[PDB]
Design a protein around this nucleic acid. Structure first.
Ligand code: ADK
Ligand code: NA
Ligand code: ZN
Length: 184
DNA sequence: CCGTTAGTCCGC
DNA sequence: CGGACTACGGG
């Protein structure tokens, strides 16, 4: 089975690639979880975060924004000691900030899913790249999404993070042409 | 440019 | 073994 260049031999990474990455996600809560996990990747490899994803789901209340938004300074200082996540105060606080930011949107008219999908025009763009070096790391759309998220109070959401989120949640489909998951 | 994680790599 | 190095926040 030929797969994208970034997939290691780790079966956890293989299942994530085959079953989740690039598959259009339209659920607001799932999208919220993914923008949070992409921010947790900053400066690190994605596999580090993926391997910890079950720990994140346990520590952050299955990414239910109401439960997250109720977390306090004491929770942050507790999580800073938890070796199952990334022990970085700014990143832990970012998940809490992001949950409050999502609530401020959703209690006030704006679907997070409608909002992120507004940065793509119709069907997800399918890459024409045969190799990872020909796939962009950010685009005009990811630039726009990052700027809009920051305006709305989100943290750890720059253009490169936003583009990786777009790939992951299938707002673009960046499976290389030779990958068995490419919609060839 | 400087600071940071977790993890890899490299030199002593 | 300890240090360098490695997409944000910062100055
Ligand atoms: C290589 N890769 C695969 N999947 C994700 N969700 C990523 N975020 C950053 N880098 C990523
Ligand atoms: Na759209
Ligand atoms: Zn692929």
């Amino acid at each position: 089975m030929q797969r994208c260049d970034w997939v290691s031999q780790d079966p956890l990474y293989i299942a994530y690639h085959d079953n989740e990455w690039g598959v259009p996600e339209t659920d607001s809560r799932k999208l919220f979880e993914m923008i949070c996990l992409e921010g947790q990747q900053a400066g690190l490899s994605w596999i580090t975060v993926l391997k910890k994803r079950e720990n994140y789901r346990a520590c952050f209340h299955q990414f239910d924004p109401i439960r997250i938004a109720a977390m306090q300074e004491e929770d942050v200082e507790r999580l800073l000691q938890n070796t199952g996540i990334i022990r970085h105060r700014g990143k832990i606080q970012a998940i809490i900030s992001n949950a409050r930011a999502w609530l401020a949107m959703e209690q006030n008219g704006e679907s997070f899913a409608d909002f992120v999908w507004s940065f793509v025009d119709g069907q997800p763009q399918i890459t024409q790249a045969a190799s990872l070096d020909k796939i962009p790391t950010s685009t005009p759309a990811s630039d726009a999404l990052a700027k809009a998220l920051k305006k709305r109070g989100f943290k750890f959401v720059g253009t490169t993070i936003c583009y990786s989120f777009m790939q992951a949640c299938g707002l673009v489909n960046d499976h290389i042409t030779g990958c068995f998951c490419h919609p060839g």
